């Protein structure tokens, strides 16, 4: 499952953003640097696929490797985040458009501080609820 990580990064601006690496439609893996996280309440890692829902294991090298974000949906709130090739946190969704459940809360996931370095000072909270019929256990980071 790890070979489905789009690893396309181009630090042409000499910022060194890649250090911490070590409307949701279809995003091209050729423009993604690192894992893609979607938040069906709980965070879900999205792997590379083709135009069909078939996973690919080429580290996002093929120009036909994409992430089917719209297919990964429960009528519940939805959103995804990822780092694009030049180091800009990209989002999509409607509740916020990323891991932002509350305007001041955020879904904690293993790459929260790399996509959102300013959320390090937030407090974790254990959340458990039934959304759309499934129980969701995750942590929320709020001010």
């Amino acid at each position, epitope marked *: 499952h790890i070979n489905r*990580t789009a*690893l*396309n*990064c*181009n*630090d042409s601006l000499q910022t060194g953003f*890649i250090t911490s690496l*070590f409307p949701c439609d279809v995003v091209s893996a050729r423009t993604v640097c690192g894992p893609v996280y979607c938040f069906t309440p709980s965070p879900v890692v999205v792997g590379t696929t083709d135009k069909l829902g078939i996973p690919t294991y080429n*580290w*996002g090298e093929n120009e036909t490797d994409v992430f089917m974000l719209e297919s990964l949906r429960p009528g519940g709130w939805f959103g995804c985040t990822w780092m694009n090739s030049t180091g800009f946190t990209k989002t999509c969704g409607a509740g916020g458009s990323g891991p932002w459940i509350t305007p001041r809360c955020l879904v904690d996931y293993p790459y929260r501080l790399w996509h959102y370095p300013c959320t390090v000072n937030f407090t974790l909270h254990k959340v458990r609820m039934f959304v759309g019929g499934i129980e969701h256990r995750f942590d929320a980071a709020c001010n």
Partner: antibody
């Protein structure tokens, strides 16, 4: 700098396993293997990004080499099989710089620093 | 594979003189992905220039590189005794990264 294994001497047709350990916490960052024969310059062999395990190889050693990394130790490995007398060289281990890095499908390329002290691999019968 | 040719094979200069080393590529490489390295006998190569122009942290000012396209040059304006060694040019913009053959700077007496 980076610590590599000592000198090795193996018969033709055998296989070597050269280690490369670093003291810093930059182990997960991309590493690159390069060898240098006596009369020639530096020759790229392959690389690995230990954070994800991506291995990219040069076309020459596509079926003869396998590069691995162990996260428990601080060591990335280069394993060259079916040795020949041409493979007698000094094998080097260096980190790919992060600032200004270019990564295409898991192959990270940039200037190389820091380096390991090198590993002499002698292939003789 | 991009072929990197260095010239001359050996440069014999006295301490204080100017050394200019050349690196010529077969393809037109991008000036942002050329590096120069210094290597002394027994030791590992040390990086001097990256991006064909920028000096590495800890490299004296007398080292300097320039060039674009196929022809690149490294200049040591005032040779010091510890500058005498072999030098290598590397390109890291094409899928198989390549190095040139060594240019050895040697003390003239």
């Amino acid at each position: 700098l980076l610590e590599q294994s000592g000198p090795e001497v193996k018969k033709p047709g055998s296989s070597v396993k050269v280690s490369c350990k670093d003291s810093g916490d930059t182990f997960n960052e991309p590493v690159t293997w390069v060898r240098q024969a006596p009369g020639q310059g530096l020759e790229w062999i392959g690389g690995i990004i230990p954070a994800f395990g991506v291995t990219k190889y040069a076309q020459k050693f596509q079926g003869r080499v396998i590069i691995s990394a162990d996260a428990s130790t601080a060591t990335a490995y280069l394993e060259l099989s079916s040795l020949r007398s041409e493979d007698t060289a000094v094998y080097y281990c260096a980190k790919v710089g992060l600032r200004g890095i270019v990564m295409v499908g898991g192959l990270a390329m940039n200037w190389l620093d820091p380096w390991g002290q090198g590993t002499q691999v002698t292939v003789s019968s | 594979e991009i072929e990197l040719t260095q010239s001359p094979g050996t440069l014999s200069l006295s301490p204080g003189e100017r050394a200019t080393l050349s690196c010529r590529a077969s393809q037109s490489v991008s000036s942002s992905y050329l590096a120069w390295y210094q290597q002394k006998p027994g030791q590992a190569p040390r990086l001097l220039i990256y991006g064909a122009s920028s000096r590495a942290t800890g490299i004296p000012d007398r080292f300097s590189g320039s060039g674009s396209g196929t022809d690149f040059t490294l200049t040591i304006s005032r040779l010091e005794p510890e500058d005498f060694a072999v030098y290598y040019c590397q390109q890291y913009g094409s899928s198989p990264q390549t190095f040139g053959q060594g240019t050895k700077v040697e003390i003239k007496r």
